[PDB]
Design a protein around this nucleic acid. Structure first.
Lengths: 100, 100
DNA sequence: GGTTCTAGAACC
DNA sequence: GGTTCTAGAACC
């Protein structure tokens, strides 16, 4: 396949029991969460990407069409969502498209 | 004076010995640094602002014309700068202007 | 106005 | 293309 390396890395990042303490799939599998935003940034992002910044990780998620899921009004949790980014459906990452 | 509350809060945030471990003036006084970005976010921002997010703190700094100082190529440090935001010159915060 | 979310554009 | 920096616009 010729899927972008961001998405195969995201898939791996999320899909990793050892990682699940800081970023894991939602129990249904239609979204993924990230806890302790700043530790994840510091302790996980560099092992997959060429930086250590949540800001820059998020920027990609937006560029590939992901949208944050809003938690409405403590709870240091950030969740993201894309229709073709589903736990049972790895072959759907091919269908994701970065906007250029 | 009728200076915006963001800037009086920034001034206080930076200018506080107890805070200086996570955000302090540059030794000359022409800029301010922030260390351990994520802890500052979590442990300081909420005591001055209605959130706990660096992203949203930065956004204001940009809105009031601050510009990040680039550290060029480990070093978990972020520095910001504004010509009318100087340690000896509190009365110059009146001269700062948010773009609208 | 402050906060949050997303995106533009420059620099790699 | 990925990263960084800043800003637009909607929602409060």
């Amino acid at each position: 396949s010729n899927v972008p390396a961001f998405l195969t890395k995201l898939w791996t990042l999320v899909s990793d029991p050892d990682t699940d303490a800081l970023i894991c799939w939602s129990p249904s599998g239609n979204s993924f969460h990230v806890f302790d935003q700043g530790q994840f940034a510091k302790e996980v992002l560099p092992k997959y990407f060429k930086h250590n910044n949540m800001a820059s990780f998020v920027r990609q998620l937006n560029m590939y069409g992901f949208r944050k899921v809003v938690h409405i009004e403590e709870r240091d949790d950030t969740e993201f969502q894309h229709p073709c980014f589903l736990r049972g459906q790895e072959q759907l990452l091919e269908n994701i498209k970065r906007k250029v």
